[model samples]
Target: KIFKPEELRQALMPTLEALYRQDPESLPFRQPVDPQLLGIPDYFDIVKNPMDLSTIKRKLDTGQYQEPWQYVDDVWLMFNNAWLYNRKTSRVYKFCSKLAEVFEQEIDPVMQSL
Candidate 1:
């Protein structure tokens, strides 16, 4: 256990928000879908101290980040950091691995919205 569930949640909030924003039509019959539908865990989900997303948002807001790709890369880095931070724990490891698995195995092949 390397991060609390909320830490992971916060680390992902930006990307999660983007996902919902860009693909609202893809989500089931709702204006803004819940994070749970996107594989986000509840308080009992993980264990660790993840990266702070506000730091990234601050950089973007203050012009520290000029390229759109910077924001995309930042999101990936945060998620990857959480995975690495919890690598020692089997439960957390599997959970993070499953996220990657779904992306590469399911989403990529189909060019899924999320």
Candidate 2:
């Protein structure tokens, strides 16, 4: 069954915050991604070096399904980096390319606000 917008929003909040808390303005775009968008094993693969398997499990087990925004975020991130999106020259392609803007325009300002 499809959830209503409110329900979906409620369910998506933690995942959204998990991603954006570190980089807010870049909502749908950023790097070192929010693993709320991955399969359990895929998520663990990247984090296993620094984080224990149990930590990964704890994050994924919060609900039966992957976070609501994960699918869209992953697709967009991948697309933006792929040949299709990169065929033309663009100022920002990945987190590394955009770090100046993220830190200068988003992160630093946000920190000052708080």
**lDDT (Cα, tens digit) per residue for candidate 1, span 8-97:** 344434544443343322133122223466465641244233433455555544555444444456645555755654445655445445
Model 2: lDDT equals 0.38
Q: Which segments of model 1 are wrong by more than 4 Å? A: 1-50, 88-114
Candidate of highest TM-score: 1
Model 1 C-alpha lDDT versus the unseen true structure: 0.43
TM-score of 2: 0.29
Summed backbone clashes in each candidate are 7, 0
* Per-candidate local distance difference test: 0.43, 0.38
Per-residue lDDT tens digits for candidate 2, residues 13-88, read 4443443444432433444434566332454453333322223233344543344444234323343343233323
Cα displacement (angstroms), candidate 2, residue 80, comes to 3.6
After superposition, the stretches of candidate 2 with alpha carbons farther than 4 Å from their true spots are: 24-83, 87-91, 96-114
Lowest-sum lDDT 10-residue window in model 2? 48-57
